[PDB]
């Protein structure tokens, strides 16, 4: 089965991407990492940074997750992600992204061993 | 220095009946853990959460074995835990890590870990 941590990898991680502005990028990547397939997933955040820059984020700042957990780490520098948000007429099967380029501190939640990045929990 | 390091202290081999302090003091981390606690494995079991506690003293959850036996307290230095073990037993026999930066008692979220230190209870 697909491990937690590919899990993020496929949802979150886009590392080749750099920052120019495209407007359909997120139509594009929310259908091809599959957060299409079963509903609209309603947020979703790419990174374009390395894999390794981003595990590393797990031995970074330890923060409260947005839902409480304790086992969140953000990233001390902001890096370059794109946020896919569902536009007003979205609707399953119909789905439908604002794409959004931003610099922001990335917050992630760990888990395993090794310890590494399985939810992407918010930017600041 | 540049490594986090969590070290264990106290420990060893204690009679039944008796008592034992465990001590864990994290370095080279520069903020603070919001949770510490001790897990354990012992001979024949898989690793176990025995005590956790969040930052400010709260969030206390305990292993329903040695509830009214063993007290954990973070009151004793920056990203210190300590594990107060009492009316021990044989079966409290185990492996007792620190662990850090993790939730509960819930030890595939926590990402730092002592190298671990034995216990063990004669009858």
């Known amino acids: 089965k697909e491990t937690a941590a590919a899990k993020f990898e496929r949802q979150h991680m886009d590392s080749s991407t750099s920052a120019a502005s495209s407007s359909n990028y997120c139509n594009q990547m929310m259908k091809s990492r599959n957060l299409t397939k079963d509903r609209c997933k309603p947020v979703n955040t790419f990174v374009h940074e390395s894999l390794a820059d981003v595990q590393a984020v797990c031995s970074q700042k330890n923060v409260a997750c947005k839902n409480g957990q304790t086992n969140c780490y953000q990233s001390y520098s902001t890096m370059s992600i794109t946020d896919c948000r569902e536009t007003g007429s979205s609707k399953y099967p119909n789905c439908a992204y604002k794409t959004t380029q931003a610099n922001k501190h990335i917050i992630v939640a760990c888990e395993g061993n090794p310890y590494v990045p399985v939810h992407f929990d918010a930017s600041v | 220095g540049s490594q986090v390091q969590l070290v264990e202290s106290g420990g060893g081999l204690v009679q039944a009946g008796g008592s034992l302090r465990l001590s864990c003091a994290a370095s080279?981390?520069?903020?603070?853990?919001?949770?510490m606690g001790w897990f354990r494995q012992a001979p024949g079991k898989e690793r176990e959460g025995v005590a956790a506690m969040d930052s400010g003293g709260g969030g206390t959850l305990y292993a329903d074995s040695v509830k009214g036996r063993f007290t954990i307290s973070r009151d004793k230095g920056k990203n210190t835990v300590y594990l107060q073990m009492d009316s021990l037993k044989p079966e409290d026999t185990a492996t007792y890590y620190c662990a850090a930066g993790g939730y509960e008692l819930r030890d595939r979220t926590y990402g730092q870990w002592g190298q671990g230190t034995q216990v063990t209870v004669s009858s």
């Open positions: 080279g981390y520069a903020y603070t853990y919001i949770y």
